[PDB]
Amino acid sequence: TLKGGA
Amino acid sequence: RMKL
Amino acid sequence: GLGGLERFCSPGKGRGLRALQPFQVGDLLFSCPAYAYVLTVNERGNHCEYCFTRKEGLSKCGRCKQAFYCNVECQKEDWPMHKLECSPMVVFGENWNPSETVRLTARILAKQKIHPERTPSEKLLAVKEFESHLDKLDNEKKDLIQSDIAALHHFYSKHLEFPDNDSLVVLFAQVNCNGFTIEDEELSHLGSAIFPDVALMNHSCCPNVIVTYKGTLAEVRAVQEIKPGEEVFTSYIDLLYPTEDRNDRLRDSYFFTCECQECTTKDKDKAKVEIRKLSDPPKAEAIRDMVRYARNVIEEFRRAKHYKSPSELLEICELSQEKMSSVFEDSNVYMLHMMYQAMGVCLYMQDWEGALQYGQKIIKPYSKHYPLYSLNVASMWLKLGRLYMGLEHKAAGEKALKKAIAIMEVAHGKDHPYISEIKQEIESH
Ligand SMILES: Nc1ncnc2c1ncn2[C@@H]1O[C@H](CSCC[C@H](N)C(=O)O)[C@@H](O)[C@H]1O
Ligand SMILES: [Zn+2]
Ligand SMILES: [Zn+2]
Ligand SMILES: [Zn+2]
């Protein structure tokens, strides 16, 4: 689980 | 979420 | 499936999502309930485990005293997932420390046991159909998954029945490839989740949609005009950094090299790594030397953040900025990185003056480096506004809060609870 901003 |  | 949208074969990108009707800036393309989700440990007591609502006076689970809820309904609805951890948390005590990825994967396995059939989260893409990139994983990534499998066995043996080792490797790889992080309005980490239909969208560094969250429900809204036939693209990563940094992360985590317009042209690279106009211009070797240094202190700080004291962490930020400033301008993204980290430390220390000074230096470079409707920009305006209000700078607070609202109305929708909350803060101080 990594998808995202900052 | 800052504790302010 | 999802009206106005279709799954298709995007050449060179596997499967993708394509628009069948036009969408204007701010339009909701679709929403997607979480297939599985977990609240991060540090946010327990502030948020309800089931629905992620932030409020004071949450009901505490009488057994483990480490999961909080809006009421008994939220508590009862969360029980099928919470029982994976409730008793183990007390029995293992201080030794209970599964990583968040393990916690999420455990809940995936539990969901599959209860609800084996296709869920409303999987209208266009099912969890079983997730990309794994198993054949591209190197030994270090495989050995880390095998470590996660050992943790899954160690902490969840009594509640879960495991598939064979091969299936667990694939599942963990699918999670690494398709899982999402949930953040609050200040981009603070709230938890991790699986959103199958949202996972279908491919990546662009100039995306035409942004994903936001209404509790545990993912929402997808246009930030550029989308025409019929055009592919729907979200961003997987922080877009602050130059092209080689973005593509280093995308290759490492998702096993592809991006070819969007930003990566192809590299038009923003030079502004992102801006160099001071000194009497004697710094040579290319000196620039590459400082970039290497910057990347090293960024890594050193990421490690130090686990054990060093707040004042020691500020020292690292201060010293690194001093050294970089001999070559880098303040708007340089490596300077902005350490400034943001320093701001984070100040916010945790409740040093509002310190955090405000860093925010004021960050916001204008953020506005030009990030895209037009960036959540990174909105949340920085929001942090500034809350700092201003807290320090009784009412006029500057109102200005900053309104700047945040103007962006969030597009990304979050005009009716989002976050926007209602922020308007109260304008008319409270
Ligand atoms: N811009 C891009 N160029 C090439 N591949 C991409 C891409 N964006 C996403 N992908 C692919 O999509 C994966 C993320 S999951 C997105 C859906 C995927 N295309 C699928 O068929 O299931 C990445 O690991 C990569 O393989
Ligand atoms: Zn709740
Ligand atoms: Zn409990
Ligand atoms: Zn790109």
Author numbering:
A (entry chain C): 526 to 531
B (entry chain E): 522 to 525
C (entry chain A): 5 to 433
Relevant lines from the article:
Here, we present the discovery of a promiscuous allosteric site in SMYD2, a unique member of the protein lysine methyltransferase family characterized by the co-presence of the SET and MYND domains. SMYD2 is a critical regulator of numerous cellular processes, methylating both histone and non-histone proteins to control chromatin remodeling, DNA damage response, cell cycle progression, cell differentiation, cell survival, and inflammation. We have determined four crystal structures of SMYD2, including a wild-type protein structure in complex with a PARP1 peptide, a wild-type protein structure in complex with an ethylene glycol polymer (PEG), and two structures of SMYD2 mutants. In all structures, SMYD2 maintains a bilobal fold, with the N- and C-lobes displaying a similar orientation and a similar degree of opening.
Two peptide binding sites are identified in the wild-type SMYD2 structure in complex with a Lys528-containing PARP1 peptide. One corresponds to the well-known substrate binding site, and the other is new and had not been characterized before. At the substrate binding site, the PARP1 peptide binds in a U-shaped conformation, sandwiched by the β8–β9 hairpin from the SET domain and a loop connecting the SET and post-SET domains. The target lysine (Lys528) is located at the U-base of the peptide, with its side chain inserted into the target lysine access channel. In this position, the epsilon nitrogen of Lys528 is adjacent to AdoHcy at the cofactor binding site. The novel secondary binding site is located near the substrate binding site in the cleft between the N- and C-lobes. Two subsites were defined based on their interactions with the peptide: the M-subsite interacts with Met-5 of the peptide, while the L-subsite interacts with Leu-3. Key residues for peptide binding at the M-subsite include Leu351, Lys387, Arg390, and Leu391, which form a shallow hydrophobic pocket where Met-5 is bound. At the L-subsite, Trp356 is important for peptide binding, as Leu-3 is stacked between the side chain of this residue and the main chains of Arg390 and Gly394. Based on this analysis, we conclude that SMYD2 binds to two individual PARP1 peptides in the structure.
